[PDB]
Amino acid sequence: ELQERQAEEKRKQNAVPEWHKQSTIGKTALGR
């Protein structure tokens, strides 16, 4: 189970951010 957990953590470490998943043009512009 630990190795499976480590593999899951390894996959998470490699996952790209959310903003890369979808084109964030329609959403409100970044800022404070």
Partner 1 sequence: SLKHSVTQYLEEIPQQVQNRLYTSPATCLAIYRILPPLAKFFIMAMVFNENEVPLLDLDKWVNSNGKLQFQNAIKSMKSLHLLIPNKSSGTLMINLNPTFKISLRNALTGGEVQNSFGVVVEENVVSLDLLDEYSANKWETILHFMVGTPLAKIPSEKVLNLLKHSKLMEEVNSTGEFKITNEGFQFLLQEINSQLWTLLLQYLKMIETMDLVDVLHFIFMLGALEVGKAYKILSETQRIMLQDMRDYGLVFQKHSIFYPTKLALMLTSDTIPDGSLIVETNFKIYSYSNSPLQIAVLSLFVHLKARFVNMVLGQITRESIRRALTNGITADQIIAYLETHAHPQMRRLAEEKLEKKLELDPNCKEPLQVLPPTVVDQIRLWQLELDRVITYEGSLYSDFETSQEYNLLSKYAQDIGVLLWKDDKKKKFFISKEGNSQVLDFAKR
Contact residues: partner 1, CB under 8 A: 11, 15, 21, 23, 25
Is 3 or 14 the residue whose CB approaches partner 1 more closely?
A: 14
Token digits of residue 22: 């979808």
CB of 7 to partner 1, least distance (A): 13
Q: Where are the beta strands (DSSP E) in 1-32?
A: none
Nearest residue (CB) to partner 1, 5 versus 11:
11
> What's the min distance (Å) between Cβ of 22 and partner 1?
9
Q: How far apart are CA 16 and CA 4, in angstroms?
A: 20
